[PDB]
């Protein structure tokens, strides 16, 4: 490319190199939004899958000729809750908890995790365990005795 920028007279000398170094690292030629870098991993369980380092369900539906759009699985539970109801926001949690205790090979039983995931998803929203999550409760000494 080639373009000859002209500037004024009362303007003093400026570095020009560093600004092109900053802006060329900022331009996006072709970005599908909220998605950076898809990658094809080692094939696991025979499942030919992909891994996407970003969460955007709405644009991946528009890629149906290469993606089976009825098997897509993430870890952003607050994005599955917005799109795929709350019952899929529950089955993701028992996966994402079990994706931590499996890598260290600690087989916690699913009966413990189904109880936790059905406690967070009792109000239809992804309630955490914190001060804000306890704010809906009935027994009020339990609120005082937390912090």
């Amino acid at each position: 490319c080639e373009f000859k920028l002209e500037l004024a007279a009362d303007t003093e000398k400026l570095l020009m190199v560093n600004i092109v170094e900053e802006i060329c690292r900022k331009s996006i030629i072709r970005q599908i939004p909220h998605i950076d870098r898809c990658v094809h991993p080692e094939p696991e369980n025979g499942k030919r899958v992909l891994v996407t380092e970003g969460v955007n369900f709405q644009a991946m539906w528009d890629q149906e000729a290469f993606i089976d759009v009825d098997g897509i699985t993430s870890n952003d539970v607050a994005a599955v809750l917005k799109t795929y109801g709350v019952e899929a926001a529950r089955n993701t949690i028992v996966n994402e908890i079990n994706n931590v205790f499996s890598r260290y090979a600690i087989s916690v039983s699913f009966r413990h995790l189904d109880l936790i995931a059905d406690m967070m998803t009792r109000q239809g929203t992804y309630l955490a365990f914190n001060r804000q999550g306890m704010e809906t409760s009935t027994s009020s000494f339990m609120k005082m005795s937390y912090e």
Partner: protein, 196 residues
Amino acid sequence: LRLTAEGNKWRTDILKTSVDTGREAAAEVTNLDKDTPADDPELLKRLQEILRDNNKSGILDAVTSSKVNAITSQVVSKCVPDGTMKKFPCNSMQAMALSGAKGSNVNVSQIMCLLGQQALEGRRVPVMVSGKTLPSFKPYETDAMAGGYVKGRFYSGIKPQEYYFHCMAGREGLIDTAVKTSRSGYLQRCLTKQLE
């Protein structure tokens, strides 16, 4: 804690060329071929180039230790069930480790066969600014030993160089203990107040 003398002959001639296993890992990384000698004036310049990068010369670790742990295959797979001076049901060092009493076959092999590579945090021995890993080495050294491969075993004792690398595998391991002491202290009492 003693073999017969044949396991040294089982390792030595290929442990002698284990410097040309590190070198043959130092040729696959630099994308040279033809098994160039280590003091080539262009091989050093590529190795000087893969020393100032972090991700490059992370591959140089992962190619080398993948290749030079295959020597530990060729030593553990032939010595320890068979080359030992006392066979198993009287061999009290294996009678504990091969029953679940205490210890396992790493601790069998680090006493009888060899230690192996003392890789720090997955990569390898760190490097100075020059290209030495110790002041006992030629800089930019293409070797198993300066990569930290420890040929000796704890029965015959470890040399002053590879003793120092094994202390690197201690001091970075013990500091995980002083960094986790209250990770899941709040988290379990965060559940039993809500699942109360």
